[model samples]
Target chain A: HMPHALITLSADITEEIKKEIAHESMKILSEVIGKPISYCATQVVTSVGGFGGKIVKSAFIDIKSISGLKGKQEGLSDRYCKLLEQKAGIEGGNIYLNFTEMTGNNWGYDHSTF
Target chain B: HHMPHALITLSADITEEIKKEIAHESMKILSEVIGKPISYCATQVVTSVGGFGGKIVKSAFIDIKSISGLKGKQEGLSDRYCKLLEQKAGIEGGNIYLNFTEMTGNNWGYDHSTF
Candidate 1:
């Protein structure tokens, strides 16, 4: 029942690149979190200034899922960060990822309880 | 350690009057539900041109930490908020969605940091 990912980046990226990042990140997230891409509502915000302590070329990813913060979960986040850095041509420390796990009942989708 | 923010995205354009309305209504709802004057409650409106099945959609994604039994009450609160959005803002409920997450003890500061 995980719905969406709210991704924010400090750098100015093109819409084409944003879509690419969303599609690729969606795949990686689905594989790591074991959820369908359709359920992964990915949203990307770019040119966000004065965020991440004003660190240029920074990223902040927030995902809501039922998954816990275990080794694999941590690995998933790490992999996403790496992918973002590689794709954006930014450094590792510039990316920040946050995962929020929730139960199925906490989600609302398709006009009903998710 | 509690930063409450709501990011609202829609397919339609939003105006300054509507933006103020959203901010006020969101602050009221969040304050009543979260049980305090939020240290920070920001509402951002944006228009997008992509979604599932090539269909345009309207949705609200709330990324918040599970704190003080907030998780248990998030559903009801979000439901009410969504309905208010529909009634007050003319947004459809069926096109809306809400998401939540627990903060993983990451220290985030605004405009300044210790890193």
Candidate 2:
């Protein structure tokens, strides 16, 4: 039972601009290939932390994949980030994604090589 | 039919390096781009006796949002040792998109709110 995550885009861009960015990002992420998708933005905090302070503008994409391909997970993430940055002026924004693959630690690690 | 609502996922990974990475990277990206830093909070992982079966890591503020004021209930499954995970190697778009049609349909006893 996973619920939609709240994405907060921090930027020098005005609130209006951030709203536009969020809309555009959601559209692309939820649409693009004609797939049904949706996203919601809670609140965008302006001037959160100082440059050298904490509180960074970032995006976290949590994905659970039944497909057992490890590289594919990373690839999907990379592609998504690149597309977001290129299309939404989200360059340098933090992008975090999580993929739950089927391959677990079923096999014990062979630590024979001492 | 009272179903439990889904609360926001807070990052709570115990690995110090991973914790730092998640927090710092996220903060850096947000601040640099936005010309400031946005609050990203999550819970930390709690240690249980003997490691086995579904290890949960927790952290706080992995997203670029304001400090979520909503609090968890005093006595509930969600509140038991809820930790935040940070610093682990992961991607950074702070949006968790999930299909909660069933959960929503079932509905929880109490009303949980989020922004």
Candidate 3:
């Protein structure tokens, strides 16, 4: 199955912080999706700009996963946003989430079709 | 119809040659799947140090969008596209991931405007 989260922040963060964010995100997302930590991965793109429509401390998270899990995505998003605030100190309108769903067959894993 | 766009992000260092190959292969697969040339398909590479708990592994994400009503078919096509990437791009199969979404609309006045 395809399970990954790409978190793009408008602020520049340290490598250590990025690692923490990735770990926290993967852990939270794994439980929400009922997938193992191995199946979960995270990417942090820091110092991104061009979010003109929004204010400062903005973030955009693009969540990618296999389809048929629509019911669980909102919870995932909510929990993640809260985590970011509590852990990383990113609060309020600073965070945004984009949930993307795809078929399991659309993923390639372990040198085989997923 | 919604114009299709696929934006791929990689955690590995990608060479110009590799980028071109990925673009070519991606366009080909998307064209075949959509039955026409795609309006946009691009890849951006970034350093993976400390990415995902400091795991030194290559991974990717493809964000796809197009006009509404093709979501179902597009999902299948994306699967095939990723499979091909694993086979041809020298990336490990387990490291690939893709995302599919729909665009609300687009503007193509530059391409269709009369001089």
Candidate 4:
């Protein structure tokens, strides 16, 4: 089955600053990986209504083109985080990259090689 | 490619009074339309972090199944915008959903139907 990866970039960025970061991060990833990546930003709310503190920016980067351990390249995640921080200035935070593979029995489609 | 379908729902309720109104209004459309919707949110600047505002919120979601075509995807944008509007209105919120079996492209070839 094809591998799908999700990288979460968290930072002390406000809602207003999020879109800019997302645009920059996506552009940077596209340029680095040689393929387009779809991304979305979501705020982690403890109890809703601003969380009454500094906003934490979370960017969900979903990469649909990775397979096996080859997808777990350490440098790739770190490099992207550094690039995002450099480009978006999202400091005082961290980025977590998670990889997921569809079960062959329930994957429904067999176009993973593509 | 194979076909696709989707279902979006709210995980928790909105926090703000005004924002809750906005959410209910937007969700009505989602329930009535009989199709999955995208979630988007915008927030106001109450505290000045660096931009002269207090706080802000941002979030968005794409319906993987409804995203099969440009039109289907476009329709989902309205709800995404609704979420954005709530955020812009200074409301804290979130949404949820599921994507069922949706077919895209032909049955035997590789397709860019679902991203």
Candidate 5:
């Protein structure tokens, strides 16, 4: 996938639940970033990551894609927050998401830069 | 702590022993490059099936974010980090990519508020 998403979560999530969350994340990325599902990848990170001043079920998401990310953050964030609430049972207001626009020349894969 | 975060993603499977080495070295590199104390630097290591050139291959993606110090420091950071990954994981330099993002204090959230 040309667009990659990194999800860091602190929820009490199972392997199966994590898979479901990631699947939905990939779909959201594909839809919002306008990339094919085949061109989208999601990586889920499990940790008791911090939220507020206490330990809570929260999430931090980082989305990186070339070209498609410039005008897409608002919709992407909306979809992700909605996804977590429905698929992962996390609240929307507490989640943090960031989108990064990357240069094709700097994105590397397979043996060379994209 | 004024934090700098480094998240390294590798396509190759690594032993726990190797991951620890990479993690510590990565933290030290970030500490030195960002001119921050090691206590304020955080580095997380991840291994996954990273696809490249239309196939599943040994590749790496290093993502770093800080409140400061990443603007023109990429070349040196890339040199050391790519070499560190190569030495520890046997991934080729050309197969690795690094991204450095410098953000404002308000952009990074910690302990309920932005730092």
Candidate 6:
């Protein structure tokens, strides 16, 4: 139960909308990463940042898990890019996304590691 | 271009100035530790309410992603980041956990472009 996705938008957003986008992110991670919705978590926050070597209103999404990230990068990016464009008004060209596959020793939960 | 993202996650609250200070310092650390240029680096700080170790303690999670290979510099990064948090964010060494990830260029995207 440990695929965590963090999405940051370079603007101010309401908590209401944050919840909306965050849930959608979770859905994408669940389907694309082959993880259950219960095992996937997401948080959407508003912050300032530049993208692609320029200052603009962009998005940065990072999806991290202990495994299951190989051969799914394109699918994950496509879904997230569309999600941002449809729900958050961020164009795919202005978004930066990354995927991180880690080891059990690197992630911890409940005062322990997997 | 080299695009590295450093995310600083902790349970302590700080002002915008301090967040900026720490973020900038973190970018420098990323450049130094990963042997990349500062111009191609960026960082984020998330100061949210978090719990750790079966208790609500002052803890941190610093995750870094860049092109593969930071072998000898891993320890140096953990040290610099922990010290940074301790001095600036008031979180000590033991509770500050870190992960250094070596990513392929294609897995990293920016400017709507994949590395």
Write one digit per residue (lDDT tens) for candidate 1, span A1-114.
Answer: 453566777666676776677667667666776666666566666655454556577777776665543445587677778778767866677767776666765665543445
Pairs of colliding residues, candidate 5: A1-A39, A110-B52
Per-model DockQ against the true two-chain complex: 0.20, 0.02, 0.23, 0.06, 0.13, 0.07
lDDT of 2 by residue, A1-114 (tens): 111223433445554454444344334333332233322112222333222355555555444322333455555565557754754455544665565432211111111000
Least well predicted 10-residue stretch by lDDT in candidate 3 chain A: A105-114
| TM-score of chain B taken alone, every candidate | 0.72, 0.28, 0.67, 0.28, 0.91, 0.90
Ranked by lDDT from best down, the candidates are 5, 6, 3, 1, 4, 2
Query: What are the per-residue Cα lDDT tens digits for candidate 3 across A65-94?
Result: 776357887788788788777656777567
**Cα lDDT of model 4 by residue, B13-52, tens digit:** 3446744554555444443443434332212211111100
True lDDT of residue B69, candidate 3 = 38
Residues B1-115, model 5: lDDT tens digits: 4488888987667898999899999999988876778987888888644543333456677887888776566666777888788889988775676666777897898878886
**Cα deviation of A29 in candidate 2 (Å)?**
2.9
Clashes of each: 1, 57, 2, 25, 2, 0
True contacts kept of each: 0.13, 0.00, 0.21, 0.00, 0.06, 0.02
**Regions more than 4 Å wrong, model 6:** B1-45, B48-115
What TM-score does chain B of candidate 6 reach?
A: 0.90
Model 6 agreement with the true structure over B3-93: per-residue lDDT tens digits: 6678887767678898899999999988887788899888988864333322344556777767765545666777788888888988766
Better of 3 and 5 by lDDT: 5
lDDT of model 6 at residue A12? 55
TM-score of 3: 0.67
Report the interface RMSD that candidate 2 achieves against the true structure, in angstroms: 17.6
* Cα lDDT of model 6 by residue, A20-110, tens digit: 6766776777888887665565655577778778877688887788889889889989998888787767778998888878776555433
Docking class of 6: incorrect
Per-residue lDDT of B97 in model 6: 51
Give TM per candidate. 0.65, 0.30, 0.67, 0.34, 0.63, 0.55
Q: lDDT: which is higher, 2 or 5?
A: 5
